[model samples]
Target: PVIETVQRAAAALLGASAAEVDPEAHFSDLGGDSLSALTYSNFLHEIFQVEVPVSVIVSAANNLRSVAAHIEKERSSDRPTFASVHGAGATTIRASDLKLEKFLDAQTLAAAPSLPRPASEVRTVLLTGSNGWLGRFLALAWLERLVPQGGKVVVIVRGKDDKAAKARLDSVFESGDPALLAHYEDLADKGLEVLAGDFSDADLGLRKADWDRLADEVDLIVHSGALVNHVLPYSQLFGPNVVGTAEVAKLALTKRLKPVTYLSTVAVAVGVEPSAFEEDGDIRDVSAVRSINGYGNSKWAGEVLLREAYEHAGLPVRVFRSDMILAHRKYTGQLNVPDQFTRLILSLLATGIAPKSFYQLDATGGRQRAHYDGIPVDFTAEAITTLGLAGSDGYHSFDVFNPHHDGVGLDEFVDWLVEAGHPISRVDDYAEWLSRFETSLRGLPEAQRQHSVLPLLHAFAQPAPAIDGSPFQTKNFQSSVQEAKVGAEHDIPHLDKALIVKYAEDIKQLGL
Candidate 1:
């Protein structure tokens, strides 16, 4: 009766039939969001004549029966409400700290774990986000090897059907080199299967039979797909980045316990101590540490989930956190136009404004300026594939920057842009430059307004509040380089005058 009451209440809130509101289904699965949770909790309070905290609904498993049980148990108790549970002094605790726990399960935290077969032994690789910028390279890199090694690669992309998924795959090949494009001809025969699925959906929205087939066929997973919007809030990103990753983890556990190679970002450590982000560094317990944006926050949450899965579920999960990945090393024109650095470069070039007063603050201390330390896409893809498959079963990092070697400070980079025939004027600080950028944006046609760099400016201008001080750090990049065996391959194309010229030309070519 309690379950039915809960089901009826949830069904009314979600506009679903009561029978459709399965007691075992999660509230999110039933389309009950935060807003709906409030109404749902209010409805329960009205029914039971007892105050129930919305936090209880949010913190619990959120299954219909579980919420009902929680409500019934609390209704009979004289215990404090969720708000008072933390007490008065708990205001200092971040909301993120409380909410993050809901994403992890006790079983996942307590389960025993085991590693997957070594990379050399892996035969069938399932890659998600193959249509994405980073994913395209990853897919091709796998193809480069799998084509010869006689291994299979299953690329799961978001689409309505196999035709749509294949088209997405074909688009990637169209942009790739001759060798990669050549393989597109006999893709199915050459061991590349593109499947239609949405990661954010429950069970990835795969048909039961297709899901079972994938579970039985795949030996590894490289989860690279995400909704990469930096300006959006964590809630906006939660569905794709967080839920999708949970789905990927589930896929990892199905049939064969496969290893997962997760593509993460250095920005996840944005608010962490510089010294703690080293090779195999443990920063999971860094309470209240938030990233610069929702995109990074969701990725951080996903990483935390995978880490838990590894610790408890015997899911062999490895993380490769990358810095700013640039265009292909040799293919100068092949660019991910949406990359933050690319946007910054193009925006500044178009606006002809730069911050005259710049500072780089980190654990090492403050400097007058900082570089946009980046690595080429080719190198990034190679390293991820190399280390992901064979390097080790833990956290590894990759950046083409070693301060003394290839690192180009932002100040110098701007100077080069000026020298490369871009008319650039220096402003006092980020605010000043942003002001100029906004002015320029106002004068632009409506067609060009969508790509305005205001979001990037807003993010880069402020110090991350979650961090006590400077958040940028390379404390462990050296160790990461050594561990990943990417030193010699780290011959990253210099971000010098020539490269800027090439980039400018490429920008012109792209008509940006």
Candidate 2:
């Protein structure tokens, strides 16, 4: 009885619906703060008519279960009430104090209808997010591989009409480099159909006839669209990230049960120890996982919806967990200008404040260059398409990244950036370096200041949760595919001086 009482109290204090409250989840984990502790302690005092100390509430790491035990113990005692128990005060609580588990857990939709699997070979594929940076590369990858084999690609883009859709697709293909534009002949010949719709829309905003037609004809669907904003709350991102996933599942369940390949981020498993991220394992608890920001949480929840589609509905689903997608290896000029990582480096170089050495802020704050995984855009597209083409019929998760042997060393890359004429003095402490960089931003033009500095500020301020041992495990992914075809060349080239030079030059040419 006390256990239920504690749970209801915690749910009220945490602004979570009763069903969303986990009895075992810690108070802090549920977004409870010191003020919440004081208020909840007062609540316990009133309900149990016993003196409940705020200190005990704040220190109860055992969560509501522990609180329940304490209440039972107090009920059996003859101790007198403390004077301060009735006078506990509460601090103002902001909207952010409410936990996201309440929002996300309550919004999970029902699974799509069960259907039979499609053909092993992907023929007429429907691709979403074709205007996105990775989407463009994926479209090119499909065109390169499937066009020559007498297959077609239907691209779904966000537009009001067919004419608008065609214009958007045309601009995407011709945006960065001539490589994609050069494939115009192949694209035209292969029946590159463009569907004007959006992921956040009902039935992807398609007319009933058009939607039915697509469902009847499409064989494979690749869902890669998402609104990638890190700072927004779960409420703002819910429609696009959560609802969009549900819509994609509905489209897959249309007339003939099309096989769906979902592109998720490696960040979904972020914060968990690398060894814990099994390539094929499922992330059952998005709230419990170690996500750093709103973006990661949304993606993790999106994957949860995908899991529901697969387990409950028997949808043929393939999930590709992509790491950092970088500049094209050969076509170095092809770059995503909004790429914050690259922009951070550029801001550091341009402002002459690049750190002299890379240091792990958590691990002893030691002077060691951290290894980060980065795969070029083209390589990522090829790996995703290759793995998606041949996997088990039900559900498979592929860890898409350069293997452990080929991760980029941050210190060496910075050294090369300096040598490429973007020289900057070094700092010993990361905090000191960040403070100096903050001051330097004021000197930049007003328009350029936020674009160049806010992202780096977020990066430095919000480091990913530290994990023991390796950050990821890919043995499962490596063993699942043929080594020579999809696994062998997955080793990425070192981010050496030559690559830095090429990248810096390309950034300059683009005036970024």
Candidate 3:
């Protein structure tokens, strides 16, 4: 008797609003899940006097109408229930405080319990950007770490066309550096699966069947493929960054996948802060403030869109906002700075200026601040892995800066360099470096050139205001580093000119 509970519940939710909720449209259309289910259940219990199980909400195999009928029938049976799920014992939590464990109850935990190691190891990660900087680094890092524990990494790349895509990766897998090549040797040797296609095309440039196959097979998705040029046109950026992200998320939703680790950037948090900047701080959604750059605006929108898929769809999603990630210590040689001054030094050294003289370095007097939590590429990787491997537990967002380790600003850097035995005594000792750098930067390859000279001239330029430190708990970084066991050793190699040159070489090649 009384199988109308489901219909009643549905009507109650609709609230005389005819804007019908599409039964076939994703649950996101209505906004209900492990997080939202508790709220919906509370309303049903209060209004209909029914006890709706959280499972019934999560397992929405039947439409809300049918589900409501099931609940109403149960209510008619005279089972006691409270108006709210947290009727005194349930812990009400805000979305900001939710973590991975919040979704699991004793019953769910008992049945599909989380173990230190997943019962089944995930092979074939469906990694994108086999040739891009972040992609290659992740592939190498994963093999070194995840492989020891047994895992597979597949790279998705778009060749000149289909044939060229496969060919490009094949050549890359073969001719890659010996050290970098070794970690991936097994995959290449065994002929790793290369989905040669562009993300800009529909179905990520894959046939419907192929797209479905990948969506079903991939365990974890590391979407690092992107068009990173800061000056790229909005339309160009939209293809890989915005639309591509949506496609990937849609695929995961279609396949009902496990987890998605999105490589977002600190750039997304550009306009979220009130004061200057805070380490590991985030800009929550609110009115009044606006993003300063296109990159930040687009990324912010991406995060909002992805949240609907992850939070509302109950998909495991982890977002990372990495700062300017310098290449690994070994590849530091490829590093290059557009600051003109750094370029000036390289030009003189290139032409054997042995002991060059300088008039003025024209820097911002080491007083102005740049908004970045600069970390070595290696550390960024460590932080990403730490956040991903968490089972039912979650981690606090972190910025990998240690004032003790990375606190040396321009003035301190100059002092330290001189103390470590560089042939420089006066403050303007490196003026020639700036001049040469600004000139050579004009035609550099792959590196964006900055003509404003604001960044480099800031060394002796006007003093800017100091940022307040009250909002940020600086000590948090140390604790996070310890917990994550990041930074193999606190070695300061840049003080030495030879090491700096070697690192600069890598940075030059990596192109920031």
Candidate 4:
């Protein structure tokens, strides 16, 4: 009956001044956010003295005519139920409204057959991390490849910071190249869902009902959310790391969904007894439980829980333990390591501090051949998505990429850095490289300097680039590539010499 009452109220408001609410118009354009939805529902209640759930207002907000009709029904029938109304043009509703046919709610995904057909089906996906540093680049990879194949992405975010999360995404769009932005726009045009919510929260910060609904709708979930900071307390980190992972696992298990490719890190493998880890080795240090920090313990616990889910019920779970993720491609020449290097080099050149001695960074023997295998964040996402579409047969364990390279050790890169004219020791750290760079250069004006140390414009500078010399040896990761291409076409852009110079400069600048 609230529908009827709503219809009469709307009629009363537009007594003589009738405005045609177009079917094509978006509810958002019609003042349809949470606040307005609530206010509108409250107004209906005051006018009719009836208690109608605000959910009705939100649902009917898309169809003003339907909302009015429902209000009118409240006045006529003892019990008013929501009924569908046909508009002139096609109706665009939220995914929550989509009729999921053969959804595995316990598993958290719809069946592959039930998803849109190949080329029309969304297979590959790109997701953002609430804790990690490579959201924008990941977004780009998805737009280029997954969008064409009906890829649906769930950008795992911290629900506590909604405005900041949105602003961060907007910044990514604004900072991205036109092609990247265009890619996102196309995906938006093709129904790419930007699932924004906290990983720490129960059910991914989704309302239980909404979570159930989404579980019944989606195909794959690429989870990248985790606490990157080492300082967070266990109490604070557990939710997003351990509890949150369990939450995602629960969704997947509950829905019996598609493969859940978890983007994990090598940190979880650290402190383990093994000198070299195999693909399927369990990463938890059960004996060292008390000695580990909160972050480590949290990640370890998360991995344990994830494996347990699969072992207990045979859930579709794929874990990817990636190297340090760096944005190989960046717009802010100042955002990554290369950008910082450029700034420092420019500064040295500008201030007449070209030193006679080319800076040679100390390897500290800290660099190991089987150590740092920094994977581009975009590539990591690609690898994960590719694995997801291939089903339960793919890598059930770790897949290290290019674990080894030819003559690409820390000292080699540093020697080349000095040859090209970069302050090797000054900026090689990348993490804390920029903090003291300015102070280190202050006294250089008095010193009679000669030829400048050049930054190696073409170098792969991983502290340990020879980890495995290849990806994690998996069951059958090769096939995932084909399956991922089901609905979309993708390409990994070639890195240019200019990109090398850009990264060198970045290393000298931001210090992040």
In order, what lDDT does every prediction score?
0.64, 0.65, 0.48, 0.47
Each prediction's TM-score against the native?
A: 0.68, 0.70, 0.58, 0.55
Off by over 4 Å in 4: 1-132, 159-165, 273-276, 284-290, 330-372, 393-395, 399-401, 412-499, 505-512
Candidate 3 lDDT, tens digit per residue, 322-343? 5455545554332324434355
Can you write out model 1's per-residue Cα lDDT over 168-264, one digit (the tens) per residue? Answer: 6676555434654666566546878877877765567678887888877787789988876555555545567776787788777555577788877
* Model 2, residue pairs in steric clash: 274-471, 274-472
Candidate 1 — what's its lDDT? Answer: 0.64
lDDT at 313 for candidate 4?
Answer: 53
| Model 3 clashes, total count | 36
1 or 4, which is superior by lDDT?
1
**Candidate 2's residue-wise lDDT over 411-498, tens digit each?**
6677777776676787876677777887887678765674575545766763343322235666655555446365345443345566
The TM-score between candidate 2 and the true structure equals 0.70
- Tens-place lDDT per residue, model 4, 1-512, is 44344444444443322243343333344545444455666687677655443334443123555555555666566211112211112222111211111112433332322332212244544354722455555555555566655565556543224454545555445433565566556665674545457554456665677677766665566677676445443443544566567667656655434456676655555444444655576543233333325566556556666665555455666777654554555453323322323333444543433321222324562334432234445565566555555545333765534343343423343444456765444343532333233344443443211111222311323222334234444333333444455223232222234444555555444332
lDDT assessment of candidate 4 = 0.47
Off by over 4 Å in 2: 1-116, 184-189, 270-274, 285-292, 360-369, 402-407, 427-432, 461-470, 480-484, 487-496
Worst 10-residue lDDT window for candidate 3 reads 78-87
